[PDB]
């Protein structure tokens, strides 16, 4: 709606007709806004008078690796899929190409175009 309004406004400025009325001017999606709770759930009375095992609760580092629902308990914390790594290719400002890597960089130490300061 804002795009159409901004487009209609911009082409009217570009035309420079001073908003001349040649023709007649002028389905809806409505989300319900989230309900506000009157009282949020208090801290459970277990936390008072209970030994805290540091094995059971999770550290920040391993909490934050699962960001979608970072759980306090270890039993909730599920193993995330292994992170894919990158194969870098360099390109200069003035020059175009410089160096690059093959399409089978897995289990290969070969460069498609070998270029380095020690090699010139």
């Amino acid at each position: 709606k804002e795009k159409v309004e901004r487009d209609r406004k911009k082409l009217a400025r570009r035309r420079n007709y001073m908003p001349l009325a040649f023709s007649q001017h002028t389905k809806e999606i409505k989300i319900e806004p989230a309900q506000a709770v009157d009282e949020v759930e208090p801290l459970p009375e277990d936390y008072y008078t209970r030994p805290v095992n540091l094995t059971e609760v999770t550290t920040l580092q391993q909490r934050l690796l699962q960001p979608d629902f970072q759980p306090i308990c270890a039993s909730q914390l599920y193993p995330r899929h292994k992170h894919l790594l990158i194969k870098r290719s360099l390109r200069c400002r003035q020059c175009e190409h410089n160096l690059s890597k093959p399409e089978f960089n897995p289990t290969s130490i070969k460069f498609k175009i070998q270029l380095v300061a020690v090699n010139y």
Binding site: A34, A36, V37, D38, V40, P67, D68, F69, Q70
Partner: peptide, 14 residues
């Protein structure tokens, strides 16, 4: 005044 807190979809950090 009636003070009511919103619970956002993602966690408080994100």
């Amino acid at each position: 005044k009636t003070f009511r807190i919103h619970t956002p979809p993602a966690k408080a950090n994100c």
